[PDB]
Design a protein around this motif. Structure first.
Motif, PDB file in Angstrom:
ATOM      1  N   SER A 120      10.807  -6.419  -5.313  1.00 25.00           N
ATOM      2  CA  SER A 120      11.096  -5.563  -4.176  1.00 25.00           C
ATOM      3  C   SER A 120      10.993  -6.264  -2.836  1.00 25.00           C
ATOM      4  N   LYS A 121      10.104  -7.247  -2.795  1.00 26.49           N
ATOM      5  CA  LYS A 121       9.708  -7.959  -1.586  1.00 26.49           C
ATOM      6  C   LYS A 121       8.430  -7.235  -1.147  1.00 26.49           C
ATOM      7  N   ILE A 122       7.683  -7.879  -0.274  1.00 28.67           N
ATOM      8  CA  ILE A 122       6.393  -7.382   0.158  1.00 28.67           C
ATOM      9  C   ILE A 122       6.310  -6.111   0.997  1.00 28.67           C
ATOM     10  N   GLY A 123       5.265  -5.325   0.745  1.00 34.79           N
ATOM     11  CA  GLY A 123       5.009  -4.154   1.562  1.00 34.79           C
ATOM     12  C   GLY A 123       5.399  -2.813   1.012  1.00 34.79           C
ATOM     13  N   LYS A 124       4.960  -1.778   1.720  1.00 34.91           N
ATOM     14  CA  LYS A 124       5.203  -0.397   1.336  1.00 34.91           C
ATOM     15  C   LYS A 124       6.643   0.050   1.519  1.00 34.91           C
ATOM     16  N   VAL A 125       7.252  -0.339   2.624  1.00 36.23           N
ATOM     17  CA  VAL A 125       8.622   0.053   2.867  1.00 36.23           C
ATOM     18  C   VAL A 125       9.534  -0.623   1.841  1.00 36.23           C
ATOM     19  N   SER A 136       8.793  -1.802  -1.167  1.00 38.59           N
ATOM     20  CA  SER A 136       8.546  -1.307  -2.505  1.00 38.59           C
ATOM     21  C   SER A 136       9.046   0.095  -2.735  1.00 38.59           C
ATOM     22  N   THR A 137       8.964   0.957  -1.717  1.00 38.72           N
ATOM     23  CA  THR A 137       9.463   2.338  -1.843  1.00 38.72           C
ATOM     24  C   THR A 137      10.973   2.283  -1.989  1.00 38.72           C
ATOM     25  N   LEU A 138      11.585   1.539  -1.079  1.00 38.53           N
ATOM     26  CA  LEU A 138      13.032   1.402  -1.068  1.00 38.53           C
ATOM     27  C   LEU A 138      13.557   0.980  -2.439  1.00 38.53           C
ATOM     28  N   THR A 139      12.980  -0.094  -2.967  1.00 40.84           N
ATOM     29  CA  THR A 139      13.393  -0.634  -4.255  1.00 40.84           C
ATOM     30  C   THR A 139      13.177   0.274  -5.463  1.00 40.84           C
ATOM     31  N   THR A 140      12.049   0.966  -5.511  1.00 38.35           N
ATOM     32  CA  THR A 140      11.807   1.874  -6.600  1.00 38.35           C
ATOM     33  C   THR A 140      12.800   3.027  -6.567  1.00 38.35           C
ATOM     34  N   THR A 141      13.058   3.573  -5.377  1.00 38.33           N
ATOM     35  CA  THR A 141      13.993   4.706  -5.251  1.00 38.33           C
ATOM     36  C   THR A 141      15.378   4.284  -5.709  1.00 38.33           C
ATOM     37  N   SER A 142      15.812   3.112  -5.259  1.00 40.59           N
ATOM     38  CA  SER A 142      17.109   2.590  -5.668  1.00 40.59           C
ATOM     39  C   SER A 142      17.146   2.458  -7.187  1.00 40.59           C
ATOM     40  N   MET A 143      16.099   1.869  -7.744  1.00 40.20           N
ATOM     41  CA  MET A 143      16.017   1.672  -9.178  1.00 40.20           C
ATOM     42  C   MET A 143      16.196   2.989  -9.930  1.00 40.20           C
ATOM     43  N   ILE A 144      15.585   4.052  -9.425  1.00 38.48           N
ATOM     44  CA  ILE A 144      15.679   5.350 -10.080  1.00 38.48           C
ATOM     45  C   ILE A 144      17.008   6.079  -9.897  1.00 38.48           C
ATOM     46  N   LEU A 145      17.497   6.166  -8.669  1.00 37.42           N
ATOM     47  CA  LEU A 145      18.735   6.885  -8.377  1.00 37.42           C
ATOM     48  C   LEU A 145      20.033   6.173  -8.717  1.00 37.42           C
ATOM     49  N   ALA A 146      20.030   4.847  -8.730  1.00 38.89           N
ATOM     50  CA  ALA A 146      21.270   4.134  -9.002  1.00 38.89           C
ATOM     51  C   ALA A 146      21.376   3.690 -10.443  1.00 38.89           C
ATOM     52  N   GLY A 201       4.969   9.711   7.515  1.00 34.60           N
ATOM     53  CA  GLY A 201       4.665   8.372   7.046  1.00 34.60           C
ATOM     54  C   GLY A 201       5.811   7.491   6.639  1.00 34.60           C
ATOM     55  N   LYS A 202       5.480   6.225   6.411  1.00 33.21           N
ATOM     56  CA  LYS A 202       6.450   5.209   6.039  1.00 33.21           C
ATOM     57  C   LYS A 202       6.986   5.354   4.626  1.00 33.21           C
ATOM     58  N   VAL A 203       6.111   5.664   3.686  1.00 35.55           N
ATOM     59  CA  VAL A 203       6.548   5.815   2.316  1.00 35.55           C
ATOM     60  C   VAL A 203       7.460   7.038   2.206  1.00 35.55           C
ATOM     61  N   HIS A 204       7.047   8.176   2.785  1.00 40.60           N
ATOM     62  CA  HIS A 204       7.876   9.384   2.751  1.00 40.60           C
ATOM     63  C   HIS A 204       9.251   9.146   3.391  1.00 40.60           C
ATOM     64  N   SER A 205       9.256   8.534   4.556  1.00 43.89           N
ATOM     65  CA  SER A 205      10.498   8.337   5.275  1.00 43.89           C
ATOM     66  C   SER A 205      11.438   7.368   4.607  1.00 43.89           C
ATOM     67  N   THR A 206      10.900   6.320   3.975  1.00 40.92           N
ATOM     68  CA  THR A 206      11.744   5.341   3.265  1.00 40.92           C
ATOM     69  C   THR A 206      12.377   6.040   2.076  1.00 40.92           C
ATOM     70  N   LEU A 207      11.524   6.711   1.316  1.00 39.01           N
ATOM     71  CA  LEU A 207      11.969   7.416   0.125  1.00 39.01           C
ATOM     72  C   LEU A 207      13.139   8.347   0.440  1.00 39.01           C
ATOM     73  N   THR A 208      12.944   9.189   1.449  1.00 41.07           N
ATOM     74  CA  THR A 208      13.956  10.157   1.848  1.00 41.07           C
ATOM     75  C   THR A 208      15.267   9.578   2.375  1.00 41.07           C
ATOM     76  N   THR A 209      15.191   8.525   3.173  1.00 40.75           N
ATOM     77  CA  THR A 209      16.392   7.904   3.664  1.00 40.75           C
ATOM     78  C   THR A 209      17.183   7.287   2.519  1.00 40.75           C
ATOM     79  N   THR A 210      16.492   6.611   1.598  1.00 38.53           N
ATOM     80  CA  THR A 210      17.175   5.964   0.464  1.00 38.53           C
ATOM     81  C   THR A 210      17.879   7.012  -0.379  1.00 38.53           C
TER      82      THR A 210
END
Ligand SMILES: Nc1ncnc2c([C@@H]3O[C@H](CO)[C@@H](O)[C@H]3O)n[nH]c12
Ligand SMILES: Nc1ncnc2c([C@@H]3O[C@H](CO)[C@@H](O)[C@H]3O)n[nH]c12
Lengths: 229, 229
Positions: free
Chosen positions: A49-54, A56-66, B52-61
């Motif tokens: 995912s690359k480092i950090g919360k943003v 990791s969230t981004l990557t997991t969501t993509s992994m699930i929805l795409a 928060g950052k996790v919520h906002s990333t998740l939702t935008t993705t």
């Protein structure tokens, strides 16, 4: 059956791709490069995912929805907060918390966000299976609470803080967000980590040293589990 | 043409749904409730991500991969870091940074993550259009750098820190992650905020007070912009 495997750094997934030894298709999306291949009868999607919360969230969501994975296994390294956890030790997360969340100004406990919760739980069955295996290869699998934030932790103070406030055993930067997203989509998730430092003034040095090795150990176990699914 | 409109708190989007006055279909996904309707000739997807950052990333993705929006406009409130920004003032983000990211242990500048960047830019054309409109209704639109982290900021110290380290004008908790995700997917994004406090010891009180109003102001402007797209 679709399975998602995640790492934070390239170093952490390279061993994984190898251990599976299958050809992988490379599919780029959202700034991430997903490795899609077939292993036995299961379809596996791998990526860092690359480092950090943003990230990791981004990557997991993509992994699930795409890709619509049905399970998510995470492997990476983490710093230790307690004595009984040492370098190269393996840990399985029971609950995860975002230790850097602070709405205290609104008289909220640390780590709490309205409409959310402080602690996030991980897959009961996956963790169970992890313990089975760990007991099948005489591997000392420690389990516990993992704390995640966007700060590389390396000071005695912060150390004591995570222990007293959350009673955490390990600290890292992607576990909680990953677990959170999976919970929101109802995907069973398992977060496995291998100690690589003790989160103190010298954590940076120790980390540069054990990264490779600790990354590998974690990878071996995770591959063991996929074999059993 | 598909347009995504985001808010952090329910309070922030309720005015939006009203101003558009159209029937909205409710589509739940990932723990978020998306409002899908049709306004004029454009399709608009509205939602509040939660804090928060996790919520906002998740939702935008989710917004991008499941609904495939082509633009993202964010409206919410923020605390002020400088004098010339006062309660109810409107600001448009030029660059955003995650002020709570710290890999200092690895001798990295604050806010930096490997394979990433400290500052994230927003849509040139959207911001341009924002200034046009602001000049068409005699609205004093201030523009500047916005700092985002998972801590409600309310202390003189942290205040000075964001200014000196990043030269930021406003502080909040979702801007940067939203902008980040959009950039990764190449979606033009615009982050608009309305001051609701001065991020000091009394920020909590002031915030509880102006939330509603400041949320509205921001909403009115955003609706003005959608009308022009
Ligand atoms: N003591 C520590 N504190 C915070 N993160 C880490 C880590 C992990 O290693 C990476 C930081 O370089 C990041 O992915 C994080 O999860 N190791 N040790 C850590
Ligand atoms: N001084 C401040 N510091 C951090 N966030 C905020 C906010 C925003 O309001 C919410 C915190 O309640 C959150 O969505 C955040 O973006 N207002 N004022 C803030």
């Amino acid at each position: 059956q679709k399975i998602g495997i995640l790492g934070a750094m390239r170093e952490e997934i390279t061993p994984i791709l190898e251990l599976f030894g299958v050809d992988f298709e490379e599919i780029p999306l959202g700034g991430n490069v997903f490795h899609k291949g077939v292993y036995h009868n299961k379809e596996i999607i791998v990526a860092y995912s690359k480092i950090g919360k943003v990230h990791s969230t981004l990557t997991t969501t993509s992994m699930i929805l795409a890709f619509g994975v049905q399970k998510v296994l995470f492997s990476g390294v983490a710093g230790s907060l307690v004595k009984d956890l040492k370098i190269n030790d393996l840990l399985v997360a029971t609950q995860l918390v975002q230790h850097d969340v602070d709405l205290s100004a609104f008289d909220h406990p640390l780590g709490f966000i309205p409409e959310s919760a402080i602690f996030i739980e991980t897959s009961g069955s996956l963790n169970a299976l992890a313990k089975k295996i760990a007991n099948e290869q005489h591997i000392a699998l420690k389990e516990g609470v993992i704390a995640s934030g966007d700060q590389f932790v390396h000071s005695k103070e912060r150390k004591e803080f995570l222990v007293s406030e959350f009673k955490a055993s390990a600290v890292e930067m992607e576990g909680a967000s990953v677990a959170f997203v999976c919970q929101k989509f109802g995907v069973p998730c398992c977060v496995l980590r291998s100690i690589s430092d003790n989160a103190d003034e010298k954590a940076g040095m120790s980390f540069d040293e054990f990264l490779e090795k600790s990354a590998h150990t974690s990878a071996k176990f995770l591959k063991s589990m996929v074999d059993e699914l």
